[PDB]
Design a protein around this ligand. Structure first.
Ligand code: LYS
Ligand code: LYS
Ligand code: MG
Lengths: 296, 295
């Protein structure tokens, strides 16, 4: 199979006066590239995919593809939807606009059955020729992609090569790689990046990497080089910022951190997302001071 | 200014991948003719997530014109997890003859209480028809707290209550004990009577798609404070109320409607699919204990 692995960043989408700051987005992507990142995930959950227009989503995917031209960094475009015809369309666009692959979150709100999830992803896989990474996050979707469904999808569709797990369930990641050791298991939860990597995972899709791309990039490469002591050490040091970046729902804290770090101008969200509480604002600032944030 | 009583979350029938518009209108007239007080087009039961904005509009219009000339009101589904999308949906609804909007809490992106407050204020201050909140944390990933609902009720005149689908009777005490003027609407058919018996003023029912007369009688008995007859119907409906969630709504109800000959094809839009063979037979079993009205 063709795969997209390693240290990857779920890119934030900066806003200036309610519009996508295109120069900032492009500017943030280059900062990721220059810090050892292997792939970028535009218009994911951290990128506020739910509140972006279909026209803004295509702009941000094009900025990513165009900023990584001439580099080793791949673009894993977010193209999920809880409507299958909608997800197929997004996957088709992302392919035709130069993305190296698609990240496709499990359907949210409507809670499809395991059979429905199978047909949903099969339709998506039959929609493009680029690699397809599943994304399982039950805390947001209301549903779980079972291990059986993932493995059946892995064996029945050539594009489906692994899963981004954000379920806090190390048991499931043992289950996956013990029955299908060929899949690419990707960490979607920064705090347990090393434990996921140490069991055979081949990359991360990180929130923290928005702020400390070099440290997440270092964590992954130590792990992939089987330097588990160096990987766990970085994992251990990052635990505090990894948890505090979820004091409120992602991406409220990470954008707050970027703003405090002077990496984006203005702390702008799209409703129903909004600035954090005063308490959370101050707590974020406290945790940040214990870490060295790279500039541009 | 409210919309209460027995209401149906209409299923959305498909024929060859398209919305069977004549079957949709014929199902609405069957609800009207069986004592239902309002219809909820393109809600969760109507597969709102997988319909296009153009189809959503079509079913809202079919509902308004099929209920034109009747006392039956239209509570159109117009929620979204993007506020600008929810505002736009509310405006159309208004522009299109709907008597009000049902606005589900934002799903997937998990906004804070402050974000949910501003989300609903934006919707409410943008249109003038009544707005019923819809709280179903099992699907959205978020809960509209009791404080937030009450604040919305008190700060916006358009927001008049909440449809609760959280299986949390404690919260329904919490709501009506601190704000007894709001309209609490049950979103869980199995506990329709307990919610009504605490001061609830209506239901938005899945079961009413198949047995509209039974849900209609249950609600009106309760609103008439005939709780013994209301509970009696609620108890008789438990089996079908429960089996109708053997898989996620509306997979079972469409199976029931199809089995009963009320729709002609068992068609879903993906990622929704027909149920397992096992659940198909169980739904078929439970139906046999109920008298299903035709057209
Ligand atoms: N807000 C809707 C539509 C998203 C359209 C692309 N950003 C959803 O999350 O499914
Ligand atoms: N299926 C997407 C698109 C919106 C159309 C129906 N609300 C969503 O649930 O947000
Ligand atoms: Mg309270």
């Amino acid at each position: 199979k063709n795969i997209i692995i390693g240290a990857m960043t779920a890119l934030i989408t900066p806003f200036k006066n309610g519009k996508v700051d295109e120069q900032s987005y492009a500017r943030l992507i280059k900062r990721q590239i220059e810090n050892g990142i292997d792939a970028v995930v535009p218009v994911g959950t951290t990128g506020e995919s739910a509140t972006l227009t279909h026209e803004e989503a295509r702009t941000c995917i094009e900025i990513a593809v165009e900023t990584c031209k001439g580099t080793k960094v791949k673009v894993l475009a977010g193209a999920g939807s809880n409507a299958t015809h909608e997800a197929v369309g997004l996957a088709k666009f992302a392919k035709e606009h130069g993305a190296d692959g698609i990240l496709s979150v499990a359907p949210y709100y409507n809670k499809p059955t395991q059979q429905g999830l199978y047909e949903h992803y099969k339709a998506i896989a039959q929609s493009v020729d680029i690699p397809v990474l599943l994304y399982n996050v039950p805390g947001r979707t209301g549903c779980e992609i079972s291990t059986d469904t993932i493995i059946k999808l892995f064996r029945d569709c050539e594009n489906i090569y692994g899963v981004k797990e954000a379920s806090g369930n190390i048991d499931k990641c043992v289950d996956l790689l013990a029955h299908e050791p060929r899949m690419m298991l990707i960490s979607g939860e920064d705090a347990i990046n090393y434990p996921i990597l140490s069991n055979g995972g081949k990359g991360v899709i990180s929130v923290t990497s928005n702020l400390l791309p070099d440290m997440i990039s270092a964590l992954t490469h130590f792990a992939l080089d089987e330097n588990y002591k160096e990987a766990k050490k970085i994992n251990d040091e990052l635990y505090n910022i990894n948890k505090i970046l979820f004091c409120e729902s992602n991406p409220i804290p990470i954008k707050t951190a970027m703003y405090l770090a002077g990496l984006i101008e203005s702390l702008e969200f799209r409703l129903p997302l909004c600035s954090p509480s005063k308490e959370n604002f101050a707590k974020i600032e406290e945790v940040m001071k214990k870490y060295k944030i790279k500039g541009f």
